[PDB]
Amino acid sequence: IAQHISELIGGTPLVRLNSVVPDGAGTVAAKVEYLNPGGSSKDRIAVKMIEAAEASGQLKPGGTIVEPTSGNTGVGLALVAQRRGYKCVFVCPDKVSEDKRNVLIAYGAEVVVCPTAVPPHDPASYYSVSDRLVRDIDGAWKPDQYANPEGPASHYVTTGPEIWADTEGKVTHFVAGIGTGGTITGAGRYLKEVSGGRVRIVGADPEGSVYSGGAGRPYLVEGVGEDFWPAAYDPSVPDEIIAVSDSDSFDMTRRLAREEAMLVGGSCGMAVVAALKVAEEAGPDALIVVLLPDGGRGYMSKIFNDAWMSSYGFLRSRLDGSTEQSTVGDVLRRKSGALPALVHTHPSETVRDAIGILREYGVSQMPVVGAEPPVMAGEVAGSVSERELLSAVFEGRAKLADAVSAHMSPPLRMIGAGELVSAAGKALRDWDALMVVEEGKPVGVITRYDLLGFLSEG
Amino acid sequence: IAQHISELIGGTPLVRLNSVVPDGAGTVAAKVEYLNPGGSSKDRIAVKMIEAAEASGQLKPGGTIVEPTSGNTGVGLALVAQRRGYKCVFVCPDKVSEDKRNVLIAYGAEVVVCPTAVPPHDPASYYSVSDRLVRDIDGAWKPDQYANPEGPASHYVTTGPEIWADTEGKVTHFVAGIGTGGTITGAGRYLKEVSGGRVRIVGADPEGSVYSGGAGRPYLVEGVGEDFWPAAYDPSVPDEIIAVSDSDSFDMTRRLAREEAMLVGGSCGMAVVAALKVAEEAGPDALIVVLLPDGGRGYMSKIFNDAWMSSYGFLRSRLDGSTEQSTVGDVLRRKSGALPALVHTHPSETVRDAIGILREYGVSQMPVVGAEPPVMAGEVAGSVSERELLSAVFEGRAKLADAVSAHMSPPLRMIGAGELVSAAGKALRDWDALMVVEEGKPVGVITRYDLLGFLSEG
Amino acid sequence: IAQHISELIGGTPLVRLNSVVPDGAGTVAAKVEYLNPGGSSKDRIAVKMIEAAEASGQLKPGGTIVEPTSGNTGVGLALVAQRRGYKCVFVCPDKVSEDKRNVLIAYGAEVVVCPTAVPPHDPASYYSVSDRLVRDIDGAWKPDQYANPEGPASHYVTTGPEIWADTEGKVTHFVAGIGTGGTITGAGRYLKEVSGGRVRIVGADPEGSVYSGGAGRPYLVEGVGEDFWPAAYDPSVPDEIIAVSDSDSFDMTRRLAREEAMLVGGSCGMAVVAALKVAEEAGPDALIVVLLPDGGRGYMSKIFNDAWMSSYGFLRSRLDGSTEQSTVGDVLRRKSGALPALVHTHPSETVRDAIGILREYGVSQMPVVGAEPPVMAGEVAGSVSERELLSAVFEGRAKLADAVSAHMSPPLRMIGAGELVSAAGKALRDWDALMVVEEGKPVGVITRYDLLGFLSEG
Amino acid sequence: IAQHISELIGGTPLVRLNSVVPDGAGTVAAKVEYLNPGGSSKDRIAVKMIEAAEASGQLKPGGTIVEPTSGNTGVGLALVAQRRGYKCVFVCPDKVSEDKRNVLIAYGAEVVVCPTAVPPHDPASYYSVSDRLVRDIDGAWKPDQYANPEGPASHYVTTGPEIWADTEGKVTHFVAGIGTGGTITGAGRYLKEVSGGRVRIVGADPEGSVYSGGAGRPYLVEGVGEDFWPAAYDPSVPDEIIAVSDSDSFDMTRRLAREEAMLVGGSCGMAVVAALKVAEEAGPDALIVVLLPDGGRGYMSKIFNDAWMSSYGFLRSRLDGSTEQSTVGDVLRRKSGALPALVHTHPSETVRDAIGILREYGVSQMPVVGAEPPVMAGEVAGSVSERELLSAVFEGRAKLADAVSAHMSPPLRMIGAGELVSAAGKALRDWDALMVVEEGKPVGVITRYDLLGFLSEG
Ligand SMILES: Cc1ncc(COP(=O)(O)O)c(CN[C@@H](CO)C(=O)O)c1O
Ligand SMILES: Cc1ncc(COP(=O)(O)O)c(CN[C@@H](CO)C(=O)O)c1O
Ligand SMILES: Cc1ncc(COP(=O)(O)O)c(CN[C@@H](CO)C(=O)O)c1O
Ligand SMILES: Cc1ncc(COP(=O)(O)O)c(CN[C@@H](CO)C(=O)O)c1O
């Protein structure tokens, strides 16, 4: 029946969370947005924008759209353009993980994307190339949802009224994953008029953000957060903005996924946790309507990955649930089956020999013993690093001909072998290395660098 | 309003393809299945099967589901189980690309998967471990959609009737992506009864498949195809099965994606091409209803990737559309802009020296000249491979002390330097190597192995 | 007492070989030349030539010597020049052993050496740079012992007369390591005059040499052999030249070293074998005087090395004497200690997958089995190489989508695991690879290339 | 004439140094010992000891010699044994230059050598295996020149009397390379008796040695020096021992080689410098007799090598004489002529990203700038090492989510690009790294570790 796929955007259903809402609180339903053809709630802002531009006249037939497509934007924008038969050229933060720009290309959109994080002030960055293309090409258009009233108008038309119709105006508080504006600005501006002041418009934003009255910071939840107040936003709409920490967002997303079957992204998790928190000041009998405008399936590379979420130092439970042993043993090899080798420098060898052996085996810490490595029973005397000798060879306090036995540092303390990594790092907090002994024999050396590399590798 | 996310499965919309249907043919609409909460059309089978099992009694509350989850099954099955609060244990073909099992775990399903392609006949394979777990665990259940009448029952209940309601019974031919059966069987068995013989039930299956009366073969479109006739299928339902080639399937998928904004998987492309072909024997005024029960977003790793689709030797157009130059130059380096000294071997050096130099530079073909490499003007005389000498050192027809100048093979022919890779391979069809000359000087050597490696690397 | 070190050249002693002379033959004494200050018998030519040049006038005080120093020439020539206080500039085969040019530099001789084996015909080669320097520098001199009568005159003065004095003219046959001439010419021209025709002047030269009436060939015994007859040689002096094979020369050198304590070079071994052979036609009571004008200590890198003498395919006994087990086991690893599983490709995987897996593990031959690698009991069916598929992918007789099970070559035969390498190669003469089974299981694959690499590595 | 090669040991000539003696000092002649058949002065001790043992009775015919062979011992010992037809088994300190044990094997001596520097106190070391073999094998003998009066007896018989005969007792002072004592003890004990007190017996020993009344230390001149007073030495013989520094020994050896054509080892250089110094307290008209009992040709690997003598931090002139600056440019690559990227980590990327990028490119110091690397003009603001972040990630003073712009260390100072390495290290003495700018742009980073690695690699 539908004339085109684009005419299925909207009418997103509502679900009732049952495991993410502590007992005794009112119903907290969620509006999922990944059921739309574009896979993201943004395709709505897209269609409206395209309709408005076509009705305006500044975009003649046969023109070319151009703007920095963060990623999901190209989705809806290219969808609409292909529906009507337009072109799509995207110049955005190179960030776009390979998958993002691969998908954007798949929808028939030429990309000349340029690296981000570099303030151009000249044609030497992503916004630089974007502006250069805008100046160059004819019949183009810079939608720039950041500053476009039609953006929020879209939501004011068919983003909040749908919520009212589904809930029949029986919604106490509407939280939203604040961003450029739209969703929040439009949803609040609509829900407030039809209910006077009966509804509170909450706003979720990662801590340390401008919307929360803080300072700048890097971002890990794509789409949310910003540093310069976009002209398409007005705080007068929201009642009070509630901040949320990143560490409590990804964990919330994983929880929600395992307990309510919502493979949503990160912004959805942030909104969910925010809403949850809001659900306390309002007593029971209240209906909280949260929004999850990101279906997380391309996010499965990192957010649900056990490594990427471990590099940033927050993973409160492994995906499989059950915590597992991660003995330093495998951590000590990461390639060897039994063990790599207890590299040692007998205390009679020359300092140059020790420095060379360290430079050849790629280590920055090594014990020095008298007898052979294997037979050693933990009586090692010397403990030579790599930075100390390098700082002593030039400081005149040593000479290559000198024997290492007169410059060895105090023997670095040893720790367990089968112990969990967690304790290993906890102990590493007070020392820059340690000697792992295998059942009672010095078997290897562990340094913070290696532990971090192992934990981040996967 | 919805009690749970699972209660949004069904009611998939219909779209009208406008660029994949040659003019003059009747309307060929498609039913997309990736708008469901599970992201795949299989979740409907999941819900029906779970309902039937619960109503039966063989799955008591607090039990545990267990079966080989191809990948998307893990989606719907775990969705339903989490809705009702069950467990999920999957033992399937290790195939499941990292993303597949990562997503399955994300939905809270313990996986003890096992490698596939190995006929166990004992506890040594994926089905082996599946059967062992089935025998071991209590309160379990082996759904095995392959043999479950309730599977096709679901399609017969709420998979075809929806099509009839949307089209009001005005559907000439219904093509489907025949798989373990389901849709192909349920949809036909329903549509036929309400329309007598007014509707033809077409079936799409990759060539060289049992459903098409052929021989076994590997698979590249997950879900489709099979070798042993599943007990849950009956060919008496379909009117006539139409086969399709793999090479014309992925290309069709990419085409459909770029021309109708349908980021569907591969099986969808196969079904689309099938119907497309069927749309000829039936004249205009006919209404065709194709099915695309796979939303391709996790497929973006390979199907829309420019490399994976190139390793299998079929890519009729690069994703960006415009064909690009891929001269042997970069192909000759893969790691450099200049050029590693065209590994040479003066015809006076000993054969042992040449074999050693080849073994050290990792090459299997090298020209031998008199003067220095750079100044050479294409008068190279010798052309020594690596297999010939190895076959001559042991065949008594040569000795290490011998000079290479008495065993060099005829000088291998040279080709262009800036020429496209396509011509390079076309010419390589008649020789096992060639000497690429850079503007008029022998610069490198190209062998089929290196060309394939370059084309498959990306 | 000696005014300078150079005045100790000459008066080399004579020794009696007792283990290199089969019983029943006459005494065969040897004149060692490595007891001179220069370490080589050539220094005598150096001193004579320098004396002649100084007495002539074409080399004024403060001049500069220049000529291509094969290696030991740099010894005596620089010795004399430093004695009198001259300079030394050497342009010769760059392939002059590293140790060789290091030693030459140590004696205070600037080297601008150039690569050899390249016929310059222009300023692009070792002789090219030598001639350019000769033309450029003033007060220079090109000794070029190749064409200098004073060279042989040196021997005629104080190289043969010493032999006569030591033996009192009681020498039947004098063999010598014929080279640029010198000893072979001077010694004979002197010994013949004082004994009429009582002494036969034998000449030793590696087979396939111009001096032996043969064809050109590469050289492995530095100093001996040549292709163009030097103008400083006259065959009318020698009685009859006897050729010798290289394979019987190095072995003779090692034998002599172990049985007579003569750490001499290779030319010495060739001369020794020559005389040894000559000692048969002449009955007992004859006194043979061989010459060993090369003390082999810098030759200990290769000649006495167990690897370099193995790369050229002749080593009739290991240095330690006792033959040792090699076993393909270690030959199968060459790294770590245990065999890395076994590259396997199940016969259901796609051909592209097999080619990629071969390209990633760096192998050119692999068996294909049904079950897992370890449990396999030698029932492997497929045997796919790397050249066959590459020749079949382009020959139209296969396609990447095709299954490897329809193109596998006949399963390559297996051999023993603990067997000696000797038998391994002997069997490899009839096949290009084999499957090494470890106690009854296919453990690895062995190819001629790997065996040669192992034997040449050491 | 000679019955065997061993009967040429002795009668070493004397030479007059002309460039290593200061004008105005008396003649300082040297006795070279590398003209003997064994190549070392030790062979004389070998012959004497073998004669004594044979005449004693504790070594019956058909026995087996066994003792720890340093490097030249096996030479003479095996020479004598092969002359008489004995066996040779050597268990000595490991490290023995590969060449050393290769040569020892060449003379037909089985070696079961064991690692050194490990105090066994059990069969776990070189002396351990030596003692075990001595206990095990029958008909053996432990010569142990360390404690054998016949050792010094040899020198007393035919090591000093030869000096007296050559100089006719006209020798003022005899310096010697004191080692186990044998040489010096015998020479002094003989020369003193025939001249009363007319001759001073000087002794040369590297500084920081027991013979010089100092403390223990590693050794770099093989043969000289010792820690425990050998029982075969008596200081009552020498008049006064003069010490010498290692740094002034190798340089003296190289000087002597270039200026007097004496390719002697290191101990010879030490003795020469000793005598040289002694030649001052004694006025002109004095005749000094130095000893060089080591012909350095196997030492050409390191002593005359430009790298090994550079690793130990003393090389006062390159072998070729002319100094040639080694600009940091090549030092900054060691892989090519162009620096391969420096850093693009702008002060906005996350700390985890920076640590990962450092861990991937193998660096411990990197600048952080705003714009692109190339266009940068030296306005870099951040300077992040690798140890600081690792010490801040665990110290609670930072978190992975934090931005690096709040933890960057003060920007490390820059230095020149074409400047000589010497100045580079001199400046590095005050900092642990620097930023090398290429003509005015930051091109790379230099750290002490890299400089040392470059200087030691060669
Ligand atoms: C999950 C998620 N939630 C919300 C937003 C922004 O919408 P808002 O400003 O109404 O919050 C985004 C941004 N994504 C949009 C930008 O608005 C895009 O064009 O791709 C998002 O990815
Ligand atoms: C695109 C597509 N179309 C159809 C099917 C199978 O459904 P059918 O047997 O009714 O054809 C699959 C298999 N996918 C299902 C198996 O039925 C799964 O559990 O993941 C599929 O991926
Ligand atoms: C062992 C041996 N025997 C002989 C010769 C040449 O001397 P001849 O020409 O008198 O035979 C050489 C060459 N070595 C000389 C070249 O004459 C050199 O300058 O190094 C040699 O190495
Ligand atoms: C240059 C030099 N000078 C002297 C000695 C020892 O002799 P001495 O103890 O008489 O001094 C050595 C040791 N070299 C002997 C050990 O005596 C060896 O067997 O190799 C030496 O290398």
Author numbering:
A (entry chain B), B (entry chain D), C (entry chain C), D (entry chain A): 3 to 460
What do the paper's sentences say?
Using a combination of biochemistry and cryo–electron microscopy, we characterized the first enzyme of the transsulfuration pathway, cystathionine β-synthase (MtbCbs) in Mtb. We demonstrated that MtbCbs is a heme-less, pyridoxal-5′-phosphate–containing enzyme, allosterically activated by S-adenosylmethionine (SAM). The rectangular-shaped 3D structure of the tetrameric MtbCbs contains an N-terminal catalytic core region (7 to 296 residues), C-terminal Bateman module (329 to 464 residues), and a connecting linker between the catalytic core and the Bateman module (297 to 328 residues). In this study, we resolved the full-length structure of MtbCbs in its native, activated, and substrate-bound conformations.
As the substrate channel expands after SAM treatment, our next target was to observe the changes after SAM and substrate Ser incubation. However, substrate-treated cryo-EM map demonstrated that the interaction between K44 and PLP is disrupted after Ser treatment, followed by the formation of external aldimine/aminoacrylate at the active site, which indicates association of Ser with PLP, in agreement with previous reports, which is strongly supported by our structural studies. (G) Serine binding converts protonated internal aldimine form to external aldimine and aminoacrylate intermediates. Furthermore, we were able to capture the formation of the external aldimine/aminoacrylate in presence of the substrate Ser at the enzyme’s active site. However, our study cannot distinguish between these two intermediates (external aldimine and aminoacrylate) from this resolution structure.
